[PDB]
Symmetry: C2
Subunit: 449 residues, 2 copies
């Protein structure tokens, strides 16, 4: 007789151990530099922190830019990308061991085992952000209803360094645009109706777009090897990219992808126009925007949505709508996260100065702040991360390079420091022989003023 | 600091339990019928047997058609196909629960966890079947590839059959998973970001996917081939009639496509398939016309009527001579699998055709057991109407003897015997077969004779 089915279950300490097991593959160890040097097999997952996170407590939207969420997004990107083919720009010779470490039976199996729990952690909040009886007519009404300055335009054009802000923006798209259509290709494997051929026609349109975005990056002094700028990828940028791998890998979510595809096709011309205009205003004639201008909706409605609704019934419509609404939530989070990061980068001189009154407030006992006393040698590079409350970094002796973003750095000497804002991506390196410094966990730095 | 890395490890009883855990998803239970009825989420893995197999003892080529290998091939096909999109021909309505059972976080994770061990079981034998030289260069690769370019074993088996049309239909269904999802394993190698070779690989896939035109799409052409000889094109109607070796051949390309450390093996296999394609399609068209006449639609094959220069050469130049043994290994591994296919298929057709004679061979074999020529273990079975034993094989020969009632003994597609009281059949080792009980009750015996010829 058939043995009983034990349901798949992985939680608590066993899940923590499984996540740590995946992430302690040596290719995921902290980088000694800020950049990956043409090695697409190395991704920084900061495995030393992973034993101390609670993967069972799924965060709501309000806590979705906390560190545990960033850590999970980084994990998921690596798990998903084991299905993608990468070779170094300079060729595979010399990088065979890393190649084999990333593409191994073990690395795939370890990542795939934790993937369900990681996806609940990453995407669970969307259950409460979105709510979806539908018919073809009411779907047509909802779609029709989907049709000024954008938050990204405002953040870049209003920046203290527009070129830096635009470069920080462009690198966010490196995983997506350089592997363009990869998540979409996941939906074209198999055997289904004429919708499969129509989905494949879209994939065919992409002279290859990846190569055009190489030129965009290179025209403003950025490189196009994955993932050079790993440590500068925002939480929300990974979240947006990972969403499409999530939909593409998990075919129970196929109809959500149908919806998201409609929305992306329907938004594509406006996005590309705005991107072209924004980049020209910032960089002038130096920037290559062919990638965006070459891309310049109804076809997805008629050729994909309609036949699927006819073949599979009205029951798929709430899934189609959910895909659109979930994606829109993620775009909002992206707008916020990116805007916050650019403001944080631009305000570094002021936040260096804010150290003094904040430090003085701690002395006067306005906040009772836990403090960590650290002593670190030269080249101890703390890979980028964030904290869930505000912190005060105070240098006692030596010299620290405090990294707040791409092209955004402060040198901090004895007696100096910086206010570190919650959820903002940052790291540090020690530039002197030894650096003695303090981290005060102030929660809200404004309470120290 | 970084905790120590515990290496991924799954073996022994823990591996057995993990395999059973995957395969006890209800969508993998025995079918009550011979055919799946337009439900692409149901695949018969015979989970009741899985606790009793030894997954740690990797078989060599000589034992690669044993039951444990068939069972593992069936598992792997299901694991790989969780990445492929299927909907029923008749639409999804009514099949939503099965859809969600196949495409679930749990079903994927359970299958992916056992996939490394399954792949060692399935493909480990190839380590001893292919040699790995350490002196490859571009010139010696060109010499080898040049040295690759009569009646085939498949042609002989079909044309020499007692029922040619039946043999050709059995042949055609072997390609259903491959041709109906055509280019799916190849698409796995086009995801990501690599050189100009990626675009060239994609240019091959575009031909196989009919440039996004459905009627011109190859899958649709093979639908017509199947339907023109009275077969259906819903996956996987004929699951129970898929040979071990046919699953092995299909799974090999999912193996190479999913595991990008094997990317250069796929480069090699792709070269071999492209260089053999015209000859295969000509022979297939000619063979099918000879068997079926004008009734058969062969457009799929005639439509199919450069990898060296556009894919192999740039990769060798970019990544160096170290990739060449992998390219060669892919070609040689694939050729070994084609040989196994030729053998397995030929053996199955001969087994199907010889059923009347094997029914008669029951008598002298049964008499030899009475005279004690072989000391054979025997299993006494009593089963009710409709107890359908899903297709499988055994590692030694068996004698099935019916004491009372009526059994439909299934040896292949369109190949059946009715066995009554006092009758029976010699069941040849490694040959795919099943049974159903056609009377209210059937009392029968299975004698494990090892080699039936020793009873004569
Ligand atoms: Fe594009
Ligand atoms: Fe920090
Ligand atoms: Fe049997």
């Amino acid at each position: 007789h058939v043995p009983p089915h034990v349901p798949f279950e992985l939680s608590g300490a066993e899940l923590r151990d499984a996540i740590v097991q995946y992430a302690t593959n040596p290719i995921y160890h902290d980088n000694l530099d800020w950049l990956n040097h043409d090695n697409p097999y190395r991704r920084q997952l900061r495995p030393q922190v992973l034993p101390h996170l609670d993967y069972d407590k799924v965060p709501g939207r309000e806590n979705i830019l906390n560190y545990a969420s960033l850590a999970v997004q980084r994990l998921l990107t690596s798990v998903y990308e084991a299905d993608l083919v990468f070779f170094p720009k300079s060729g595979l010779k010399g990088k065979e061991e890393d190649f084999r470490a990333f593409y191994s039976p073990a690395n795939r199996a370890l990542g795939e085992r934790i993937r369900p729990a990681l996806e609940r952690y990453a995407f669970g909040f969307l259950d409460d952000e979105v709510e979806t009886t539908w018919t073809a007519q009411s779907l047509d009404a909802y779609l029709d209803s989907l049709d000024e300055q954008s938050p990204v335009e405002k953040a870049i054009l209003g920046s203290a360094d527009r070129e830096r802000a635009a470069r920080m923006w462009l690198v966010q798209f490196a995983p997506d645009f350089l592997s363009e259509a990869s998540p979409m290709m996941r939906n074209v494997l198999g055997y289904y109706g004429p919708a499969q051929s129509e989905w494949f026609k879209v994939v065919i349109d992409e002279t290859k777009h990846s190569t055009l975005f190489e030129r965009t990056l290179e025209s403003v002094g950025l490189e196009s090897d994955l993932h050079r700028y790993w440590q500068y990828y925002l939480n929300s940028s990974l979240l947006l990219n990972n969403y499409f791998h999530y939909l593409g890998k998990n075919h129970e979510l196929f109809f959500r992808y149908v919806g998201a595809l409609y929305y992306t096709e329907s938004s594509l011309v406006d996005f590309c126009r705005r991107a072209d205009h924004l980049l020209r205003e910032v960089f002038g004639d130096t920037v290559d925007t062919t990638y965006f201008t070459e891309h310049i909706g109804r076809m997805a409605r008629e050729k994909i949505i309609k036949p699927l609704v006819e073949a599979h019934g009205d029951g798929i419509i709430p899934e189609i709508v959910r895909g659109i609404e979930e994606y829109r939530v993620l775009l909002e989070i992206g707008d916020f996260d990116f805007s916050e990061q650019i403001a944080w980068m631009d305000a570094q001189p002021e936040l260096k100065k804010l150290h003094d009154p904040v430090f003085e407030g701690l002395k006067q006992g306005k906040v009772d702040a836990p403090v960590a006393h650290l002593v670190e040698p030269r080249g101890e590079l703390s890979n980028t991360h964030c904290h869930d409350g505000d912190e005060l970094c105070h240098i006692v002796s030596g010299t620290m390079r405090f990294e707040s973003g791409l092209g955004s750095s402060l040198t901090l000497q004895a007696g100096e420091g910086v206010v570190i804002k919650r959820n903002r991506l940052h790291g540090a390196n020690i530039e002197s022989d030894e650096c003695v410094y303090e981290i005060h966990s102030v929660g809200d730095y404004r309470k120290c003023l």
